[PDB]
Amino acid sequence: HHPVTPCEAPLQWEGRIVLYDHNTGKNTRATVTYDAILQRIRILEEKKSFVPCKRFFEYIFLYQEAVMFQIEQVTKICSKNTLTEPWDPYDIPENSTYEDQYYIGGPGDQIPVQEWSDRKPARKYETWVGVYTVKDCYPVQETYTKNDSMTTSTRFFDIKLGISDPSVFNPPSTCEAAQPLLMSG
Amino acid sequence: HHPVTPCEAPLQWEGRIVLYDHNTGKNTRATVTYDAILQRIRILEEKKSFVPCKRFFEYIFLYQEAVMFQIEQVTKICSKNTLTEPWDPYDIPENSTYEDQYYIGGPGDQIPVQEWSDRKPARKYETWVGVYTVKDCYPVQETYTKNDSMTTSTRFFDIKLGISDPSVFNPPSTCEAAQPLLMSG
């Protein structure tokens, strides 16, 4: 029985992701503190042994106040910018096309999930697909070929409901500053 | 404790996948019958309501006999071709760099998995990443940015150990034929 609407994804959680940007072939790894109630999300990039990028950023997105802070974790050199952009939660729009349900993982230790997309018969390809657990409606994976081939796959994990540490949305001392554009060296 | 070697993935199973080709933005959906012992894999593309592609193929890959059959499921018009290519199982090479372990899905209904890649500090980006379950070492997802930006993400599910139906590797009557190149209309 094809669901009449998608489950409603959690509004607040702390978890970790891997964002795979195809444009560049890069996997960023991140710890994420997510809050759809306040329309704010904090992403702390993660470092691994013997990677060639010198630079790692914490991002703090505050859509309610239309600004994003971006801190180089090493130098601490902040970067306040504006956000023109409308907030996009990690959930499933109510107009989303159901696609499938299946069990991930082998017999015994497995788990049922669901696949939705923005497929409509008008267009050749989808621009969104998401997989979410059946029980709690947690995000597992999304792909968003947004803006003509700037496509990303995102994987979510170690999710844990709610927010133990709200301090992390408070931008640090060094953030009474300006609008640089930082990227990875 | 960083694993000294990766678990050994199953050699035979019947499951289903979604292959996301970025070049084109297309998700193919498929049923798969996989056998690393005989180095052969049969992929039966799957149809959904109100997609705009008219054409759907069953592929039968027989690496031990260096040939691939390709059947249009509608017209039945076969297409035997040669395979120059070395077989690549769905597993984790023993020289693979461990990356992480984490739980997919929310509290209660979740499942531990593992992430490996072909990262070495010599090269900026990975060209392979795979996620596999911890218990049974089942494939969950891979991304293989092979050959300079011909990158794919693959998701695996409804996997079930072993092969109930070996008939499917036997090419049909209409396959005493030749080497067309078929693609989707």
Ligand SMILES: [Xe]
């Ligand atoms: Xe979203």
Ligand SMILES: [Xe]
């Ligand atoms: Xe997509």
Ligand SMILES: [Xe]
């Ligand atoms: Xe996805």
Ligand SMILES: [Xe]
């Ligand atoms: Xe991708």
Ligand SMILES: [Xe]
């Ligand atoms: Xe592989």
Ligand SMILES: [Xe]
């Ligand atoms: Xe990759």
Ligand SMILES: [Xe]
């Ligand atoms: Xe992956």
